[PDB]
Amino acid sequence: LPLTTFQQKISKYFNSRLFGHDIESFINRHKKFANVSDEYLQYIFIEDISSP
Amino acid sequence: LPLTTFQQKISKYFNSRLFGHDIESFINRHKKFANVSDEYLQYIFIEDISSP
């Protein structure tokens, strides 16, 4: 999943003003790129894993 | 080789927003300055010499 898509989906889920560095800490803890460095995150959401 | 082309070559392996602190850390660790009009480092890329 793209980082921008992840960020916008988490922003529409939870307000990004109240929750600040929490999301960046979460991604810095558990983010990959399917490479040494890229622009995509190997993670999925609940509404996406529910869908086939 | 100049720092700008060093960055251009390294942009395809490591992302700056990932580890810019570490990138500048090793850059200053191995900085030698001098040559031309900008700083120069003693480093070559294993992938480049491996490729024809």
A31, amino acid identity = K
Task: Read off the tokens for B35.
Answer: 């040559």
**Over B8-44, what HEC string results?**
HHHCCCCCHHHHHHHHHHHHHHCECCCCCCCCCECCC
| Data resolution in angstroms | 2.9
Long-range Cβ contacts of B33-36 (<8 Å, 24+ apart): B36/B2
Closest alpha carbon to A3 in A28, A50, A22:
A28
Task: Read off the tokens for B10.
Answer: 């390294």
B22, amino acid identity = D
Interface residue of B15, B17, B19 to substitute, partner A, most A CBs within 10 Å: B15
Interface residue of A29, A33, A37 to substitute, partner B, most B CBs within 10 Å: A37
Which residues of chain B have a Cβ shorter than 8 Å from any chain A Cβ? 13-15, 18
Method of determination used here: cryo-EM
Angle, vertex CA A47, rays to CA A42 and CA A51, nearest 5: 90
Q: Do A33 and B15 touch (CB under 8 A)?
A: yes
Cα A27 to Cα A24: distance, rounded to the nearest angstrom: 5
